[PDB]
Amino acid sequence: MSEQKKVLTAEEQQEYKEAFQLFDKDNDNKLTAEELGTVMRALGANPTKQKISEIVKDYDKDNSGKFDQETFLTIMLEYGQEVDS
């Protein structure tokens, strides 16, 4: 295959699986605000810990201050692609 899709495809699933897995040696199956900020930076540019921490505490208040793969997979799946570039 000449073309490739790193979004809403198997490539995205594996990419994120290893991304969170490698950044989760504690084996918690989740990532804290700080951890999420590191992986999120790859999707955006380079935000501040205080900024990301505020979004995590506001986006994750009905659960906790951690991130679950299911949440990221659901959001990326509902968006259809999220990023265009």
**26 by DSSP, 3-state: which?**
coil
Nearer of residues 74 and 81 to Ca ion, judged by Cβ: 74
Q: Which residues sit opposite 31 in a β-bridge?
A: 67
Q: Which of 13, 15, 39, 60 binds Ca ion (CB under 5 A)?
A: 60
Task: Say if strands 30-32 and 66-68 run parallel, antiparallel, or are unpaired.
Answer: antiparallel
Q: Which stretch binds Ca ion (CB under 5 A): 1-9, 14-22, 23-31, 73-81?
A: 23-31
Number of residues located near Ca ion, criterion CB under 5 A: 5
Least gap, CB of 5 to Ca ion (angstroms): 27
Counting contacts by CB under 5 A, is residue 28 touching Ca ion? Answer: yes
Q: Give the whole-angstrom CA distance, residue 33 versus residue 1.
A: 37
Beta strand residue intervals within the chain, DSSP E: 30-32, 66-68
Counting contacts by CB under 5 A, is residue 24 touching Ca ion? Answer: yes
Q: Which residues bind Ca ion (CB under 5 A)?
A: 24, 26, 28, 60, 63
